[PDB]
Amino acid sequence: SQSLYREIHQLISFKDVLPDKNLLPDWSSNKNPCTFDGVTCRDDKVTSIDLSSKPLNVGFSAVSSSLLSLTGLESLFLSNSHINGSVSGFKCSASLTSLDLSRNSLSGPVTTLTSLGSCSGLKFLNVSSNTLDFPGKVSGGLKLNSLEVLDLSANSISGANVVGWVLSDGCGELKHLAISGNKISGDVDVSRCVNLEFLDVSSNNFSTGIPFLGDCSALQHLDISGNKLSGDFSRAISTCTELKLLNISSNQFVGPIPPLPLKSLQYLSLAENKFTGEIPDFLSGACDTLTGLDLSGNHFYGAVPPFFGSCSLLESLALSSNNFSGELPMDTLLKMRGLKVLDLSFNEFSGELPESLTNLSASLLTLDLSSNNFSGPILPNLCQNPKNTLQELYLQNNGFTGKIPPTLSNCSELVSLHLSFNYLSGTIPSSLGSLSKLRDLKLWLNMLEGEIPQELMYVKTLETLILDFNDLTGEIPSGLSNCTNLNWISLSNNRLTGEIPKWIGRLENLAILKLSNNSFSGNIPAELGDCRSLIWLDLNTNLFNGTIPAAMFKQSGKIAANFIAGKRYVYIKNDGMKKECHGAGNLLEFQGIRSEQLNRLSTRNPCNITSRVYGDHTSPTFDNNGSMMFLDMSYNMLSGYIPKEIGSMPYLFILNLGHNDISGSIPDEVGDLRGLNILDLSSNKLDGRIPQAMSALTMLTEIDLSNNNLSGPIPEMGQFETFPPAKFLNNPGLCGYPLPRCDP
């Protein structure tokens, strides 16, 4: 027939408009479309097309003209296909039921989608993750009353009462309405939508009424999270007898936990709200069905009540960031057969760990008891049971004493071990080398003595080793060369010795290296320049010597460094007041630790308290090009000259080379450091003129050139007049404002 002849010519005309011909190489003319990649056929007729995740780079007009008009096309999946432009009127086939145009660059007002009404059989529509918007006053309607599923999420839709617009010409067929990640406000009325099962209006701008649900006859999923909502949500959902998931998290709800529909409830989040009081006993009605609970980030208190024993289907229990107290309720927890994640972090649970915690090692994937007032030892009998399924053990920021148990090596599935901010003595057990799946070993601010275990070489998966603020001794073990995936090594404030080993260059994923306040010696290895991800090098307060090698900056302009983002951190900035406090600032790991317990550092660290504290979840700025961001090598015995390659790092914020024996002049290339905020070159033997090229630097917030033998006039252009005299003092030959006038 003509429809076969039409089908092949339409498909091939689509191929021909594509900028890249190679995307559909098997598509060709005079060949059966049912043999093509992307095509589904039933009885030798095209029924579905799937060109998802292929960079087609074509407008919607090409899709509508060629593909959506094909006779008998039932579904068209073009998610992440690099389609742009706008929807408008076209001839749509009557058989088309599903259309996925998610994750594209579609633009224009959201009223453009009304022209999809041509598709008389359209039931499923996904235009999420596009750039659609709603300019001005909201009037008319979407007029796609035949849809069972509509996903308009993660657009640029900004407006009041956009939900009434979607639902204006009826919603009797609508089963799933998702419109999250927009800036929608106003009223949400879904009372006429009597078959609605799924409602997601989350991450929006609703600060008014709770959505009115009517009889709520079919509603199983209700997500109103990430808004500014308050008021009587209890009354609004009380008729919702079928409700399985209720996520009201990240809102302004207050008071105690009110009555809920419990009989079918599986997931409940009241997290990040302003809720108060104790967990009421009426939540026992959820225990036949409750799979997940989240009461994190509220002002709850008391104990976990004993009804949770009956909640035997409960997989995750998150009671984080509240004021829960008492001993660890093991009689309740051991009865929860289903429990896989236990998150009791940022509370005031107290006493020693009960012996019966050993039993939950074989069932839990995650145990988080961080930031609590737990005392006594870590249980040596943990992971005594065979088949220990435990992946994450977070015990940081407690009052734990004694040794790190070697028997922790029996948790063979363990990916993260965080035992920081405790009072732990003894050695880091050699048996932790056995943890063959371990990525994160964080033991900082304890009293750990001994050497760093050579046997850590057997941990092939090790990504972070955070051992700051301990009483550690010996050299860096050569075994750490074997751990090739290391991206964050931090051994500061110990009594470690030896050289930075030359094999450090073999660590290709290494981003952050912090070795400050130790007795490390010898030359700075040129092999640090072989590290193709290194953005943060802090070596301050050590006994390093020799010349700064030119070769360490060879990666400048070549670094791609976007593996380390997602990890929480803290940057405690130094202020130039205390002579005992050294360095620009301590970048430190900070997952699951309260900033209020940073006062614990005071007895180990001379640097003030938290003069400038930044807690901001990591995350490097650049993409394709890249360079080192932070370079502190202060308070060592470094000699020779600063090489001219020091100015080859455009992303360098901080450069502290202070308190060394560095001679020659300040290279002119320093003016190329366009991203530089801080430049400490003080207490060296630098001589000659401050180069005029440094006047091009526009972003210096701090500078220090004092205690050198610099001469001539201070540059009058740029930022030098901003800085006080003290930053240029003890430079006998140096003159010009802020210092006195240069007289010949």
Ligand X SMILES: *[C@@H]1O[C@H](CO)[C@@H](O[C@@H]2O[C@H](CO)[C@@H](O)[C@H](O)[C@H]2NC(C)=O)[C@H](O)[C@H]1NC(C)=O
Ligand Y SMILES: *[C@@H]1O[C@H](CO)[C@@H](O[C@@H]2O[C@H](CO)[C@@H](O[C@@H]3O[C@H](CO)[C@@H](O)[C@H](O)[C@@H]3O)[C@H](O)[C@H]2NC(C)=O)[C@H](O)[C@H]1NC(C)=O
Ligand Z SMILES: *[C@@H]1O[C@H](CO)[C@@H](O)[C@H](O)[C@H]1NC(C)=O
Ligand U SMILES: *[C@@H]1O[C@H](CO[C@@H]2O[C@@H](C)[C@@H](O)[C@@H](O)[C@@H]2O)[C@@H](O[C@@H]2O[C@H](CO)[C@@H](O)[C@H](O)[C@H]2NC(C)=O)[C@H](O)[C@H]1NC(C)=O
Give me the residues that bind ligand Z (CB under 6 A), please.
Answer: 158, 183, 185, 205, 301, 323, 325, 348, 457-458, 482, 622-625, 650
- Tokens 């207490």 belong to 683
Interacting residues toward ligand Y by CB under 6 A: 493, 517, 541, 580, 582, 602-606
Q: From the list ligand U, ligand Y, ligand X, none, which binds 269 (C-beta under 5 to 8 Å, kind-based)?
A: ligand X
d(CA 7, CA 93) in angstroms, rounded, equals 13
Print the binding letters for residues 232-251 with ligand U: x by CB under 6 A, - otherwise.
Answer: --------------------
Helices and strands, counts by H and E, the chain: 6, 51
Q: How far apart are CA 735 and CA 725, in angstroms?
A: 10
Given the complex with ligand Z, which of 480 and 548 has the nearer CB atom? Answer: 480
Among 40, 69, 75, 84, binds ligand X (CB under 6 A): 84
The annotation status of 569 as a binding-site residue, yes or no, is yes
The Cα–Cα gap between 511 and 525 comes to 16
Closer residue to ligand X in complex, CB, 182/586: 182
Q: Which does 522 bind (CB under 5 to 8 A by kind): ligand U, ligand Y, ligand Z, none?
A: ligand U
- Binder of residue 493, out of ligand X, ligand Y, ligand U, none (CB less than 5 to 8 A by kind): ligand Y
SS3 (DSSP) at 497 = strand
Angstrom distances, CA of residue 517 to CA of 143, 466, 553: 68, 15, 23
Nearest CB to ligand U, comparing residues 543 and 717? 543
Interatomic CA distance for residues 334 and 357, integer angstroms:
8
Closest CA to 709 of 741, 686, 675: 686
Please state, in angstroms and rounded to a whole number, the distance separating the CA atoms of residues 631 and 528: 12
Kindly tell me which residue out of 522, 667, 688, 712 binds ligand U, with binding defined by CB under 6 A.
522
Nearer to ligand X by Cβ, of 177 and 432: the residue is 177
Say how many residues make up the chain: 744
Q: Minimum distance between the CB of residue 688 and ligand Z, rounded to whole angstroms?
A: 29
Q: Scan residues 214-243 and list those touching ligand X (CB under 6 A).
A: 225-226
Instruction: Note whether 249 binds ligand X by CB under 6 A.
Output: yes
Number of residues in contact with ligand U under rule CB under 6 A:
4
Which CB sits closer to ligand U, 350 or 639? 639
Partner whose binding site includes residue 249, from ligand U, ligand X, ligand Y, none (CB under 5 to 8 Å by kind): ligand X
Contacted by 546, from ligand U, ligand Z, ligand X, none: CB < 5 to 8 Å by type: ligand U
Convert 705-732 to b/e letters by CB count within 10 Å (16 or more is b). Answer: bbbbebeebbbeebbbeebeeebbbebe
Integer Cα distance of 385 and 355 in angstroms: 13
Q: Any binding-site annotation on 737?
A: no
Nearer to ligand U, 497 or 707 (CB): 497
Q: Which does 580 bind (CB under 5 to 8 A by kind): ligand Y, ligand X, ligand U, none?
A: ligand Y
Please choose which of ligand U, ligand Y, ligand X, none residue 605 contacts, taking the beta carbon within 5 to 8 angstroms, the exact cut-off set by kind: ligand Y
Q: Would you call 617 exposed, middle or buried from its count of C-beta atoms within 10 A (0-12, 13-18, 19+)?
A: exposed
Q: Which is nearer to ligand U, 519 or 595 (CB)?
A: 519
* Ligand-binding site membership of 359 (annotated): no
Is 586 labeled as ligand-binding?
no
What is d(CA 611, CA 575) in angstroms, rounded to the nearest whole number?
7
DSSP character string of 397-441: SSEEEEPPPGGGGG-TT--EEE--SSEE-SPPPGGGGG-TT--EE
∠ at Cα 441 (438, 443), nearest 5°? 155
- Name residues whose C-beta falls within 8 Å of residue 68's C-beta, 6 or more positions apart in sequence: 76, 90, 91, 92, 93, 96, 99, 119
The DSSP annotation for 173-209 comes to S--EEE--SSEEES--B-SS-TT--EEE--SS---SP
**Residue 10 or 202 having the CB closest to ligand X:** 202
Collapsing DSSP states into helix, strand and coil, what is residue 659? coil
Instruction: In angstroms, give the least distance from the CB of 472 to ligand U.
Output: 18
Give strand ranges (E) for 319-425.
323-326, 341-343, 348-351, 366-368, 373-377, 392-394, 399-402, 416-418, 423-424
Location of structure tokens 């003030």:
608
Binding residues for ligand X restricted to 265-284, rule: CB under 6 A: 267, 269, 272
Q: By CB under 6 A, tell whether 597 contacts ligand U.
A: no
Q: Does 576 bind ligand U (CB under 6 A)?
A: no
Residue nearest to ligand U (CB): 545
Q: What share of the chain is helix, strand, coil (3-state, %, to 5)?
A: 20, 25, 60
Please choose which of ligand Y, ligand X, ligand Z, none residue 582 contacts, taking the beta carbon within 5 to 8 angstroms, the exact cut-off set by kind. Answer: ligand Y
With CB under 5 to 8 Å by kind, the binding choice for 158 among ligand Z, ligand Y, ligand U, none is ligand Z
Residue 267 binding partner per list ligand X, ligand Y, ligand Z, none, with a CB distance cut-off of 5 to 8 Å that depends on partner kind:
ligand X
521 binds ligand U (CB under 6 A): yes
Q: How far is the CB of 311 from ligand X (least distance, A)?
A: 17
CA distances (Å), origin 166, targets 147, 237, 293: 11, 22, 32
Is 685 a binding residue for ligand U by CB under 6 A? The answer is no
Closest contact distance (angstroms) between CB of 594 and ligand Z is: 13
- Residue 65 or 431: which CB sits closer to ligand Z? 431
Least Cβ distance, residue 639 to ligand U (angstroms): 6
Q: Between residues 254 and 543, which has the closer beta carbon with respect to ligand U?
A: 543
Residue 294: which H helix or E strand, with range? strand 292-294
Shortest CB 18 distance to ligand X, Å: 11
Residue 674 backbone phi and psi in degrees, to 5: -65, -30
Task: Compare residues 160 and 378 and give the one whose CB is closer to ligand Z.
Answer: 160
Q: Per CB under 6 A, does 57 bind ligand X? A: yes
The residue within the footprint of ligand U, chosen from 95, 230, 385, 545 (CB under 6 A), is 545
CB of 621 to ligand Z, least distance (A): 9
Cβ at position 492, least distance to ligand Y in Å: 9
Q: Across the beta sheet with 543-547, what order do the strands follow? A: 497-498, 519-523, 543-547, 637-639
Residues 185-204 interacting with ligand X (rule: CB under 6 A): 202-203
Q: Of the two residues 609 and 726, which places its CB atom closer to ligand Y in the complex?
A: 609
Query: Which conformational region is residue 300 in: left (phi greater than 0), alpha (psi within -120 to 50 degrees), or beta?
Result: beta
CA distance 59 to 87: 9
* Interaction of residue 546 with ligand U, rule CB under 6 A: yes
Strands of 18-65 (E only): list them.
39-41, 46-50, 58-59
Nearer to ligand X, 180 or 516 (CB): 180
> CA-CA distance, 403 to 380, in Å (whole number)?
9
Say how many residues touch ligand X, by CB under 6 A.
Answer: 14
Calpha distance 683→712 (Å, rounded):
18
Detail the residues annotated as belonging to a binding site: 569, 614, 619, 677
For ligand X, the binding residues (CB under 6 A) are: 57, 59, 84-85, 202-203, 225-226, 247, 249-250, 267, 269, 272
The annotation places the binding site for brassinolide at 569, 614, 619, 677
Give the footprint of ligand U on this chain (CB under 6 A): 521-522, 545-546
